[PDB]
Amino acid sequence: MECPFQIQVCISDRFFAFPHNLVEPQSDVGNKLIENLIVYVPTDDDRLYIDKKQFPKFNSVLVYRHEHDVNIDSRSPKKTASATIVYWNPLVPITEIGAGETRVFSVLLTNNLFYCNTMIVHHENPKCPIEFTYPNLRPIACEIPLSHFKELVESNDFLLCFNLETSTMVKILSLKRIFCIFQYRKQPARYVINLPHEEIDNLYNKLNWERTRRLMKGDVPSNCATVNRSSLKYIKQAQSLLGIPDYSQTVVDFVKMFQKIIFPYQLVPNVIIKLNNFDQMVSSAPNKAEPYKKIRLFCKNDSIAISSSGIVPINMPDFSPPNTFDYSDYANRTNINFVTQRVLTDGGFSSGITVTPVKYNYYL
Amino acid sequence: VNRCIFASIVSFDACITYKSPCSPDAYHDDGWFICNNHLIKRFKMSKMVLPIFDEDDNQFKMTIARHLVGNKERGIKRILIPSATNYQDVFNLNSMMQAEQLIFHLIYNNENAVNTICDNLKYTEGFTSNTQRVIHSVYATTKSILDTTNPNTFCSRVSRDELRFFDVTNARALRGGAGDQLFNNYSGFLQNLIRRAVAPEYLQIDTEELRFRNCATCIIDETGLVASVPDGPELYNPIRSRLQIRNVLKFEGDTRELDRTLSGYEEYPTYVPLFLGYQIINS
Ligand SMILES: [Zn+2]
């Protein structure tokens, strides 16, 4: 799909609250100013926090919940220049537009909004928030934000909850609402979530798609995120094997600790390889079994780079087929077997032994 | 698999064995965690089920308990439940076994005594034995039972509006009211237990608001719940199982063969229900 001509989107996380100010009276060509204004919202709940008096510019202001009808469905929606119209963080495609070019102000890029006139006015928010789940708690009414305004400012550990009936889109909405404000907060508050989370992990994948959609025009922010099962179980286990002074210690701790040694040893930690190995997709990708996504890794001023598989010269496809080949006089089955038998005898070992020659790439 | 907290109860020594064990329902899933045996034993109550017409003979059902208090006794003897304010005053914990007193200190958050007795036991031979891990297994059990959110799951739901008010409907029954405020301050485990026990007088549904008994059975009490009729004389609670008077000035009652004549007619049971206040449920 696409946005029909004469519509534009402003994304800003600040728009999580209604930006009353920005809107201006639309007019038709011929200066036919349109003080009639209608706004569509996901819920009357939204309307509860919207003041008419903000808009003395207009004499006629009304607001209703969006409903996705059937009969008007079109790539080209119905037009009605007789009133200005705005949709506020709409979830689903819109069937009618107001005076002049219509504009929408939303926090989230839906698939519907892909090919669209767009502006984001993004800015980097540094402070990544965090999850923590021990199993005192801040209980939250896990939808209405301002219910807990100042509460979220003051405390840093919050419970997250839902009734069954919630539409997946509504869940996604409210969650997305959270994280913006959290990155605005000065401290990494800890999420706690009362859900089996598997499909929630799936919608996290969807967040990945959405955020890439942003990145098509975005800030390339250093946005923290993670896989939530295949990572976490293994990381927990790894710490377990390690001394566990802080079971609560952030992963990035370990990350950068390992980082300290990269250049001096010029090689990739197994840890980071298991990362980008045990994601569904951004990894060796068990989805498709694509270790072919080897990491080529470079650092400032280097004449060379570190692959998943040793040193490489810059910007070349991991290994030239022409090579100082592992000529089969070496790595001959026969010699391999002979040496292996020597080994087995010497060990006095019945079983469980295998051997393989080393191999080499661009460099030896 | 078995879940009754009183089946989880263990005794520190072979003598003082925690015999007379849980009712077999301990194998059931009920969310009381008390066996009915223990519920009778400790608080003079027995649990029960409301059959609700699911708009039909179709299954809609709700749990209830009858109380087992008599009609004559007063005050503490009428009390059903304490607060931490008075839990020791009600239980006389010293009579009770040390793990029982421990668990009461858990419910009432007497961490001071809890840690005191824990530290005393540490070096005792029987606590170098895995009694510690047993007690903390009970701890973990409660932790799960409140891992279901103690406020959010129990009442601070995202369907928040589907609230129970236990406040007395009668505007003249003014000793209620802030009892509902107390409810928030009771520990969430107990809040849930009440939410089980107590029938509402009323429920709002998108279908209708509906009314189930004319007048409330009891009232909220300022320490813990009590056989607390809003007004008048206490209703005659019969008892179903020492040099004193037991006069019963009965009517002479010579109309023999009454039962053989009438027994087909409805033999109205008497045990006191627990109507109180207004539930709200969406659709
Ligand atoms: Zn029991």
B46 in Cβ contact with B68 (< 8 Å): yes
CB-based contacts of B48, cutoff 8 Å, min separation 6: B63, B64, B65, B66, B271
Return the bridge partners of A37, or none. A61, A84
CB-based contacts of A267, cutoff 8 Å, min separation 6: A306, A310
d(CA B222, CA B242) in angstroms, rounded, equals: 34
d(CA A153, CA B215) in angstroms, rounded, equals: 46
d(CA B187, CA B109) in angstroms, rounded, equals: 9
DSSP-assigned states of every residue in chain B: ----HHHH---SSSTT---S---GGGGS--S--S-HHHHHHHHSEEEEEEEEESSSSSEEEEEEEEE---SS--GGGGB----TTTHHHHH-GGGS-HHHHHHHHHHTT-HHHHHHHHHHHHTSHHIIIIIHHHHHHHHHHHHHHHHTTTTTTTT--SSTTSPEE-S-S-TT-TTSTTHHHHHHHS-HHHHHHHHHH-B-SEEEESS-EEE--SS-S----SSS-B---SSSSPP--------------------TTHHHHHTTS---------B-SEEEE--
CB within 8 Å: B156 and A161:
yes
C-alpha distance across the termini of chain B, in Å: 35
At A59, list the tokens: 């004499």
d(CA A15, CA A146) in angstroms, rounded, equals: 14
Q: Which residues between 151 and 190 in chain B have a beta carbon less than 8 angstroms from any beta carbon of chain A? A: 151-153, 156-160
d(CA B93, CA B82) in angstroms, rounded, equals: 13
**Chain B residue nearest residue A133, CA to CA:** B147
A27-28 and A32-33 beta bridge pairing:
antiparallel
- DSSP category for residue A227: -
d(CA B41, CA B26) in angstroms, rounded, equals: 15
d(CA A181, CA A203) in angstroms, rounded, equals: 20
CB within 8 Å: B159 and A140:
no
CB under 8 A, 24+ apart: contacts of B30-37? B30/B3, B30/B63, B31/B192, B31/B196, B32/B63, B32/B193, B32/B196, B33/B3, B33/B4, B33/B5, B33/B6, B33/B145, B34/B4, B34/B5, B34/B6, B35/B4, B35/B6, B35/B7, B37/B6
Say whether A297 sits in a helix, a strand or coil. strand
- Using the mean position of ligand 1's atoms as its centre, give its distance from the Cα of residue B23 in Å: 6
User: Hunting for tokens 């802080």 — which residue is that?
Assistant: A246
A200 in Cβ contact with A139 (< 8 Å): no
Q: Does B109 touch chain A (CB under 8 A)?
A: no
d(CA A162, CA A93) in angstroms, rounded, equals: 25
CB within 8 Å: A139 and B152:
yes
User: Which of B146, B149, B184 best probes binding to A when mutated, by most A CB atoms within 10 angstroms?
Assistant: B149
Say whether A60 sits in a helix, a strand or coil. strand
Describe chain A by its helix, strand, coil percentages, rounded to 5.
Answer: 30, 15, 55
Q: H or E segment at A263?
A: helix A262-265
C-alpha distance across the termini of chain A, in Å: 52
B51 in Cβ contact with B64 (< 8 Å): no
d(CA B184, CA B220) in angstroms, rounded, equals: 13
State which approach was used to obtain the coordinates: cryo-EM
d(CA B222, CA B63) in angstroms, rounded, equals: 25
Count other C-beta atoms under 10 Å from residue B125's C-beta.
8
Q: Does A30 touch chain B (CB under 8 A)?
A: no
At B57, list the tokens: 């003979």
- DSSP category for residue A215: H
B80 in Cβ contact with B224 (< 8 Å): yes
- Using the mean position of ligand 1's atoms as its centre, give its distance from the Cα of residue B120 in Å: 27
Angle between helices A198-215 and A168-184 (to 10 degrees): 60
CA torsion through residues A224, A226, A228, A233, sign: negative
Say whether A205 sits in a helix, a strand or coil. helix
Angle between helices B188-197 and B132-147 (to 10 degrees): 60
CB under 8 A, 24+ apart: contacts of A316-319? A316/A362, A318/A294, A318/A361, A318/A362, A319/A361, A319/A362
Q: Which of A135, A137, A162 sits opposite B158 (nearest CB)?
A: A162
Conformational region of residue A157, where left means phi above 0, alpha means psi within -120 to 50, and beta covers everything else: beta
Residues shown for chain B: 283
Q: Which of B144, B152, B159 sits opposite A194 (nearest CB)?
A: B152
User: Hunting for tokens 């003041």 — which residue is that?
Assistant: A51
A193 in Cβ contact with A132 (< 8 Å): no
d(CA B215, CA B275) in angstroms, rounded, equals: 8
What does each C-alpha distance from A315 to A237, A312, A359, B38 come to in angstroms? 37, 8, 21, 76
A65 in Cβ contact with A87 (< 8 Å): no
Dihedral angle over CA of B210, B216, B219, B224, nearest 10: -80
Q: Where are the beta strands (DSSP E) in chain A?
A: 7-11, 27-28, 32-33, 36-41, 60-65, 78-79, 84-87, 96-97, 102-106, 117-119, 130-131, 157-160, 190-193, 304-307, 310-313
At A237, list the tokens: 């286990």
A113 in Cβ contact with A9 (< 8 Å): yes
Q: Which residues between 111 and 150 in chain A have a beta carbon less than 8 angstroms from any beta carbon of chain B? A: 135, 137, 139-143
Conformational region of residue A342, where left means phi above 0, alpha means psi within -120 to 50, and beta covers everything else: alpha
